[PDB]
Amino acid sequence: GGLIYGNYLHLEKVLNAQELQSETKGNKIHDEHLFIITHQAYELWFKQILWELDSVREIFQNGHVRDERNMLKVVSRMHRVSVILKLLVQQFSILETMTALDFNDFREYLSPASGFQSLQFRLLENKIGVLQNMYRDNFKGEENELLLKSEQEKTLLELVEAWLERTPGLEPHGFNFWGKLEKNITRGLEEEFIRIQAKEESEEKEEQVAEFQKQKEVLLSLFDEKRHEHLLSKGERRLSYRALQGALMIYFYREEPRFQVPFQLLTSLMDIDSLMTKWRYNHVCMVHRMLGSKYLRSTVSDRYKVFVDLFNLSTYLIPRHWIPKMNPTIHKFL
Amino acid sequence: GLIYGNYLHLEKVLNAQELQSETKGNKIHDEHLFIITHQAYELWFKQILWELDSVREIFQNGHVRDERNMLKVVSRMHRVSVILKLLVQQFSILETMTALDFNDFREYLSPASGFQSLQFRLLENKIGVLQNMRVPYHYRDNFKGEENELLLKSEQEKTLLELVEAWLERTPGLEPHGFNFWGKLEKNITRGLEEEFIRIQAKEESEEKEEQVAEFQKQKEVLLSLFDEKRHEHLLSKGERRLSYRALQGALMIYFYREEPRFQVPFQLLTSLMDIDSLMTKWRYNHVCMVHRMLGSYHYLRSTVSDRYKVFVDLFNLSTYLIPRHWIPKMNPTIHKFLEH
Amino acid sequence: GLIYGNYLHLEKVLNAQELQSETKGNKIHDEHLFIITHQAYELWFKQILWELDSVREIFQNGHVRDERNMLKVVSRMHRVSVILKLLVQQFSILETMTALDFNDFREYLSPASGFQSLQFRLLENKIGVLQNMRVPYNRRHYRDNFKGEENELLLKSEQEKTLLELVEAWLERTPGLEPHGFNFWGKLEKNITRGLEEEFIRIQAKEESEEKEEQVAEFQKQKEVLLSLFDEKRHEHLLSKGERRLSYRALQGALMIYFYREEPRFQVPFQLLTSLMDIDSLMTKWRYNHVCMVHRMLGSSGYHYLRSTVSDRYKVFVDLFNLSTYLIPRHWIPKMNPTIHKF
Amino acid sequence: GLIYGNYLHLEKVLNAQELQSETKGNKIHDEHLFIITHQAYELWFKQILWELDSVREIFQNGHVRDERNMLKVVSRMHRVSVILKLLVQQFSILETMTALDFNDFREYLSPASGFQSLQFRLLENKIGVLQNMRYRDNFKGEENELLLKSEQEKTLLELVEAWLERTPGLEPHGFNFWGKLEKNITRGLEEEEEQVAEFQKQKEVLLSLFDEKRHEHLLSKGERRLSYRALQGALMIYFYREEPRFQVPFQLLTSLMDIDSLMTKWRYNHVCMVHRMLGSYHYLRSTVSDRYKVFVDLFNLSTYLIPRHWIPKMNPTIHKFLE
């Protein structure tokens, strides 16, 4: 009674799950089989991503992430989620071998089933941390229950936020990253202005003054906590002010041994956001090719990027020399 | 009301994941990826079988005789290669699993094997892999009951190789009464080889010249061996070739006159059959490299990455018999109009 | 003896890498990646223009009229889409450069601009992006980024026949449109009038259920969509507003190929229409990947102009895509009799 | 003011395309594809050499000893992997050239050879493909000089070897990894119709690890490449990858295997490409072998995988030494 391949993979279920509605209603359409397998393969891969993402969530929730031995496992699993998403984006290439005209021969047999009825796609969006401030009454029972759990349980965004708030170096009576960054950027701007004013009155000099004033407003706006809370409340920002500070600390001090793998995490979170919006864009394109002129387009935006704040740290890049120096004491803490 | 989950029978697809590591109270995280990865391969093997069997059926029932159906044949065979190309990239997901982590659940797999993939064997058999082509360690002893019944059917029913062969034997232009391609081709290669021997013999005695002589003499042996039907039967018997002499003629006719309207899509079909063989071999290669990365030290698998498992090896080997454009027999207005839709 | 390096002119290609950061005394490692990446895109843009110009010529010199040339036209157009697929994947190399590292050398690039890619503009023009339909960046015409010989080539590329115009002309001559022959358009209008009446009658026989109420609104929209197809005045209006590109007769040609693609003479022509949509869709994906790249490097107008290029405006063969709108059940399609089946 | 075309020296890059078929008054369309494809490979080979040299130099000049440099080292080796992946995919473009169309211009290529790609040889050498396991007649002048430098200057393999030898945990008077590992395996192998056969061959595999003389013999054959102490370093990083100081080192070892795999995948696609165009030179089939895998020792550590319970447990004092 040894283990057999087919039994191990429950192929008696996986390979007996293919029912063409076109056939069930006496008008078998060959390409319907493709439509079915493609969706079943997406849903297996959605199940794998939920498996990886729930395991990473738990490592944050149960405090194991506090032990930095576990940062390799956390980054390898998040990196794995992006490798799967890359395959899922490539996988539209298969459904592009189906013409609009052959889709047209079986689409009537699909009504009224909706993509909005993909539980796992909703679970994945909620568990990464997509805003509810955007419906979703398409579910009932055990399914409607899993959705509610996914809505109330801590999102990856919330768990990363809490961990970013504990980033070493933010302590005002320690390294005091924020205090020193505000000072160096202020002095840096004052120096850059004096350099600029010393010049003769060229139109070049006017385009420099105007560039300086733009730079000054953007960089100093980083230190406006009221502005951050206002933008948080409008949904344009997602991380707490202190989590923003921790992310920037990891960005600027990425080479410090304790920050190396955390920097790979932040990168991988941005990759997952990029690949999800590539998924949504290839899908929008697929729908247009099939139905022509005839909400999905609205989902291809920064509104749906959970880690929008990680992207927007590029806005606040400063000359390398303005970054507060690490002395031997804080070099060795890191 | 038809519902997404019900339409796709997700109550089966998403309730088919059972970790043996967990079953035996030592749940290993990466076993889940091992299961999903294979299940995804097996969904796509089923889709390939669906395309492939539909194309076999279009040859078998004679609908292929009506050239309206060539676009459908080429789209479905191209679709098979687009699927296989994703299946080759899909290994990159299993590469995110280290040897160390695989080693933690590996023992719970024994003794289930890849040889027990029914669909992989159905797919090999239906393209046209013969028992004689296969290396042992016999493949059918891994199966029983209705699975053993389906495999037998896969060996006994007409393969894509056989159905393509029958269709290539009927390629217009081969008829000795008509365009008489083979006769004109032998004439023009014999004539072209004579003109070439003459150009070379004209050159001043130099090491370069003697290098061109020996190059010509081997080229002359290769090109003229094309017309040796009994050399062809000998290569059939050793398994170095698979297509009938007449099928080989039909292939080479489509190859040289590809731009003639009636041959445009048939040329794309010959191209897709090579693609399918290349991508099956690339699958075999990535699978071998995957096993090496996970186990270190298998020799059977390395054997499978060779022309012995390429069903349409003859279509690759037509490149061997490339000649100068001007040697290709010219077409008169009557044979031009016969190759027009 | 011809040598590999001499044949490939590697003495030019591999001596064209000058880091501006090094030239001004502060060598930044990653600028070398920035340079190779662009040089690789520009070689491939040259290859695309070589394929594209060869196909334009085949239409322009009348060789396309001999249907034996269709395999060459479709292989070269398929080749263009295979290159564009690689160019889309090539962003993944430049994604290994972090915003912090790009920031160390961006100052040395000023004021060089992607707007100054001559090959990218030639490519857009030759496919058939019209200058009067371009979004202006910084309130200016794209051609004022260029002077002298380059400005002149761009003008030739705008004035010379575009791939859209040549395909348009070829589509106008599609067999089956002749009113005194198969009379495609006439038979299509009649079959759609009929199918619609038959569909109305099936629906009005279904109580007054909310499902029936829905099918009535849905029927009403499809009827307006399908019968607007036959309104040639509405088409000329949309042609002038640039919301369409193909002549009314070209649209008929395309829909003739779409519906009768399995007919032997239409099989490779259908592959050409597919490949033109592929090129549009892959140029849009390039524009999309470039936009995402600009965001990753600079954060959050220039970010908005690039977003404006990821739209149906810049899809030269948008009409081929929009034929999906005019899909009808297979049995409404005019049947082919033995006379036109054989032609 | 700086211009895009001048910054990129397009006046050189886009004026380097000479069809030999055209030069001899029989212009063959597909020859342009053949030239651009090779030019793109060579731009990318140049980028790989730039990355690979910067990494070699970080080892050679001692900066790798400062562990803050490990992110930079793994980023750039990962970048090499990503480029090599594009180059494997890039064969897809030359696959749009039929054998027949190649046949129309291949005569005008003779006698230029692939063996004359300088950068490809520079690349193989700098990584550390050994000469005794294999080309240089095909070059003269400055090119022949650069090839000698690339054979004589320290390879990536040599620099990685040196660095692996200093891997903390090997010191006999410290954690004594090798000592404790030999102990635990032998004690673990203590064990109680059947298939007792597997146990025996298994025992021989595991214990052959501790045969330093076997290793030196295989080292001289070129069937192994890493010094015995390098192999101890490597295995330490493998078993203790989670330890903070080993996490990025483990990524680097993975990247080095990735590069071997992708170079072989390039060799394999190239071999298929030759077979597609010329039919049935296949010396190239020999190059698709572990003989040409510089980091074969890193791949082979999978053979010496043991039950976790046997891996020497780590005490707090060494846990703290590995941060």
Ligand code: HEM
């Ligand atoms: C022929 C191909 C496709 C067409 C025509 C299509 C059509 C649509 C349409 C019209 C919607 C909007 C809601 C609705 O009417 O149901 C939608 C949403 C959706 N589709 Fe598809 N779809 C296609 C392929 C796919 C595939 C391959 C997947 C794979 C899982 C998928 C997953 C979804 C999901 C998850 C949604 C909800 C999207 C969101 O909320 O942002 N679709 N699709």
Ligand code: HEM
């Ligand atoms: C960790 C990854 C993998 C390992 C270690 C592995 C190992 C092996 C081994 C040892 C064999 C020889 C027969 C046996 O004992 O089972 C084999 C054959 C096979 N494996 Fe895998 N395999 C892996 C991944 C895959 C995947 C993802 C597939 C996808 C379906 C697959 C499909 C097969 C097939 C069909 C065979 C039979 C192939 C033939 O006869 O030519 N393997 N594999």
Ligand code: HEM
């Ligand atoms: C770090 C990567 C990149 C950044 C930050 C970047 C940035 C920009 C920006 C700001 C513009 C608009 C204004 C301007 O012309 O300066 C632009 C346009 C453009 N870039 Fe890039 N770019 C990047 C990579 C690339 C690459 C790899 C290519 C390859 C050819 C490219 C080609 C172009 C082209 C052709 C335009 C004009 C686009 C149009 O009119 O639609 N860029 N880019």
Ligand code: HEM
């Ligand atoms: C139609 C495509 C190709 C054919 C027929 C071809 C043919 C060959 C042949 C016959 C050799 C053996 C040496 C010789 O006789 O010159 C070779 C080696 C080589 N080819 Fe190609 N080749 C092709 C494409 C490419 C491409 C795209 C590259 C990209 C740079 C390339 C790079 C090389 C290199 C570097 C070698 C030396 C390889 C080694 O020692 O392992 N080839 N090729």
Ligand SMILES: O[C@H](C[C@H]1c2ccccc2-c2cncn21)C1CCCCC1
């Ligand atoms: O949106 C559904 C299709 C629906 C669906 C049904 C069954 C399985 C998967 C999917 C799916 C995925 N995205 C949309 N859908 C209709 C809506 C009208 C245009 C044709 C498709």
Ligand SMILES: O[C@H](C[C@H]1c2ccccc2-c2cncn21)C1CCCCC1
């Ligand atoms: O090779 C099989 C694993 C086997 C298998 C079992 C269950 C599900 C899928 C697979 C599979 C795929 N290729 C090989 N196998 C054994 C033999 C020793 C090495 C790995 C475990």
Ligand SMILES: O[C@H](C[C@H]1c2ccccc2-c2cncn21)C1CCCCC1
């Ligand atoms: O647009 C240029 C860069 C420009 C360029 C210069 C040289 C080589 C390639 C490129 C390129 C590609 N896309 C935009 N650019 C600036 C504009 C300001 C932000 C930093 C990028």
Ligand SMILES: O[C@H](C[C@H]1c2ccccc2-c2cncn21)C1CCCCC1
């Ligand atoms: O191998 C060379 C071609 C050679 C070459 C010449 C010019 C530019 C690039 C290349 C190349 C790449 N791989 C092999 N070659 C010949 C050898 C005889 C058969 C046809 C190809």
Ligand SMILES: C[C@](N)(Cc1c[nH]c2ccccc12)C(=O)O
């Ligand atoms: C002990 C700690 N791991 C510290 C910590 C928090 N966030 C970080 C980000 C980067 C590096 C370290 C940290 C923890 O509190 O989880």
Ligand SMILES: C[C@](N)(Cc1c[nH]c2ccccc12)C(=O)O
């Ligand atoms: C009538 C025919 N379709 C002729 C035929 C056979 N093989 C071909 C290959 C290419 C082109 C045509 C054919 C048939 O016999 O099927």
Ligand SMILES: C[C@](N)(Cc1c[nH]c2ccccc12)C(=O)O
């Ligand atoms: C004789 C012709 N080759 C006819 C033609 C025009 N457009 C077409 C589209 C599909 C098929 C044929 C045509 C010509 O006039 O070019």
Ligand SMILES: C[C@](N)(Cc1c[nH]c2ccccc12)C(=O)O
């Ligand atoms: C001080 C040290 N960086 C130690 C070292 C050597 N090899 C390693 C591998 C992994 C981790 C650390 C090391 C050095 O000597 O380089």
